[PDB]
Write a protein that binds this ligand. Structure first.
Ligand code: NA
Ligand code: ZN
Length: 630
């Protein structure tokens, strides 16, 4: 095992890393996945007691949905039957004009469509909701892959093709039609890929800022009857909508014509089956995850319980997470984490104040972001009003229940377009082992799920908590000023609040941060420092402010506790195949580098373990990088 001076991650996690098998039903095992499993176990036990009666109606619905999802017997007995009439319906839509003419039913009955609606805040007016117009994803895990014809692309397409053909076989397609449909679908997928942003581009917010008038939406999609169908669910049609990506919607009328309709139709049919299959028998849900497992190198499907709990969470995660927090997250832990967050924000203000490169105007607006920043702590006091509109009925099968929730969800959101953003909507449920920052709300969220070992304990020392949870708190605050966040004001609106020289100085730090991670190895895979720049900025400035809470002259034993606890909180063991996929899409660097890279920027690291120039965890002073705290 390496010395802590040579490899912090392996000196701390190396014993666990070498001995811990990755279970065949997982692609990764980690501090967070193991905690997630523990949480799931407890909550499944609790929800199992709540069908007949529960504390509230939404919790009864949550329990009911879990019971349906968990009913292996029923789901086995039904098999593929529940989907068959949906597939017959799509199969009778043989032409583009019949597709258009059926569009009211397709929209009503929650079918796979070439555009899907999502409602959230307008980036140029964060006080109000806007309709976002999303579309299909590509089969390859990055749209940029289609630029290069090679063996990996062929292998990935073959894996998907094998899944898709077997799913069509399950519903009675002949060998001939399997092949024809899969080939036709790939042809749509290949043409789609030309108008889907590369993953690197998806890491920048401005990629999603694609406003268009309602008329322009009609000009782009009215030939399919989609805008008209959507409009029936709204009191008024909005003046402005937003395309999720730049190039897809404008090109939809090339992508989907009467002549190439059959390629869309094949893709739509395969994807409807794949989507609904998640709610059918255990065999069929497993079949529907085959391709993603191939990409992950995962030998087996997830456990039945993990799968059934996942389904209940699709629609009732906030309700479940609210119950989790009310039940298992203590008032004294909540008060101590609340105090920690207040302290970190206070120290972040001190750091902006002491900062020596920001000009006065820019520094003030940075402070404004810390001034309006809101904190969502543990779990919501009040459930979001969506939960006045979701329901689950006793006798429904799982697919019927899921289709209803989807319909209720779509109908609710179509009614939110004339309305102000509800600040009571949380972006994470209370039991989630995660945390977040939302630039549109300028807020930070810390679900109860993450506020326990291995991240936090009332019984741990302040230095341990700072390392386990403080750096996370700091990370989330830092997202307000990362390369995305810095583009929004303290009201959640995209607005340039930087001077030219300060914006130039900032850009150079971002550039240095990409360079600090670019090309580093994980499991044999190259890390993309541009892709991951936003998260590496947040890690760096988050660790910085958390370290500052140790005071001006910390004891070495506390400096050590901070780094050890941080390092342990990141213990992660993943399949090399999963790394390859993740490292092409995820804005986060891998866990080993999130541990070993950032620390070497900070004098407290050198002081903690008396790190010398010959040590593996030594960075030359002129390569050390800090952000606000300089
Ligand atoms: Na994470
Ligand atoms: Zn982050």
């Amino acid at each position: 095992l390496p010395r802590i001076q040579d490899d912090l991650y392996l000196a701390v996690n190396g014993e666990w890393q070498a001995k811990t098998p990755i279970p065949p039903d997982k692609s990764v095992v980690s501090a967070d996945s193991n905690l997630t499993d523990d949480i799931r176990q407890k909550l499944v036990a609790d929800l199992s007691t709540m069908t007949k009666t529960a504390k509230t109606l939404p919790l009864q619905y949550a329990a009911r949905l879990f019971a349906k999802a968990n009913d292996q017997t029923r789901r086995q007995q039904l098999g593929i039957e529940p989907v068959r009439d949906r597939i017959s319906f799509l199969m009778a839509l043989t032409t583009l004009d019949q597709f258009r003419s059926a569009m009211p039913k397709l929209v009503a009955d929650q079918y796979v469509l070439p555009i899907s609606p999502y409602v959230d805040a307008d980036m140029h007016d964060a006080e109000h909701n806007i309709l976002n117009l999303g579309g299909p994803d590509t089969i390859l895990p990055d749209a940029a892959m289609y630029n290069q014809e090679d063996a990996e692309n062929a292998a990935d397409l073959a894996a998907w093709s094998q899944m898709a053909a077997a799913m069509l076989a399950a519903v009675g397609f002949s060998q001939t039609d399997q092949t024809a449909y899969v080939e036709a679908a790939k042809r749509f997928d290949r043409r789609l890929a030309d108008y889907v942003p590369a993953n690197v581009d998806l890491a920048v917010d401005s990629t999603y800022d694609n406003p268009l008038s309602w008329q322009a939406f009609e000009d782009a999609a009215g030939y399919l009857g989609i805008p008209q169908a959507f409009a029936t669910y709204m009191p008024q049609t909005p003046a402005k909508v937003n395309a999720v990506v730049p190039a897809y919607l404008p090109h939809l009328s090339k992508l989907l014509t009467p002549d190439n309709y059959s390629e869309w139709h094949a893709w739509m049919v395969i994807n409807e089956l794949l989507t609904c299959a998640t709610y059918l028998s255990d065999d069929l849900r497993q079949l529907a995850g085959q391709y993603d497992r191939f990409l992950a190198g995962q030998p087996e499907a997830s456990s039945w319980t993990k799968h059934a709990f996942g389904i209940a969470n699709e629609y009732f995660d906030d309700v479940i997470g609210q119950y989790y927090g009310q039940t298992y997250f203590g008032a004294d832990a909540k008060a101590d984490v609340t105090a920690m967050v207040k302290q970190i924000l206070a120290q972040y203000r001190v750091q902006l104040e002491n900062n020596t490169w920001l000009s006065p105007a820019t520094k003030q607006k940075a402070m404004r972001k810390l001034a309006t920043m809101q904190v969502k702590m543990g779990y919501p006091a009040r459930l979001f009003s969506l939960y006045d509109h979701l329901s689950v009925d006793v006798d429904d099968d799982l697919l019927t229940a899921i289709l209803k929730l989807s319909a209720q969800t779509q109908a609710f959101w179509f009614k939110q377009l004339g309305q102000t953003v509800d600040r009571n909507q949380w972006n994470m449920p209370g039991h989630l082992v995660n945390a977040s920052y939302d630039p549109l709300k300028n807020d930070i969220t810390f679900p109860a799920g993450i506020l326990q070992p291995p991240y936090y304990s009332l019984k741990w020392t302040r230095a341990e908590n700072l390392g386990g949870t403080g750096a996370t708190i700091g990370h989330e605050i830092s997202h307000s000023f990362d390369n995305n966040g810095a583009l929004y004001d303290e009201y959640g609106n995209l607005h340039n609040w930087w001077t030219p020289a300060d914006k130039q100085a900032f850009d150079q730090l971002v550039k240095a941060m990409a360079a600090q991670f670019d090309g580093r190895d994980y499991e044999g895979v190259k890390v993309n420092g541009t892709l991951t720049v936003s998260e590496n900025m947040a890690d760096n400035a988050g660790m910085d402010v958390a370290l500052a809470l140790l005071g001006d002259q910390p004891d070495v034993k506390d400096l050590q506790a901070f780094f050890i606890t941080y390092a342990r909180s990141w213990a992660t063991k993943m399949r090399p195949e999963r790394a390859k996929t993740v490292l092409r899409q995820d804005v986060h660097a891998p866990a080993t580098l999130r541990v070993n890279v950032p620390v070497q920027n900070f004098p407290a690291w050198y002081q903690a373990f008396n790190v010398q120039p010959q040590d593996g965890m030594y960075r030359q002073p002129q390569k050390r990088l800090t952000i606000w705290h300089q």
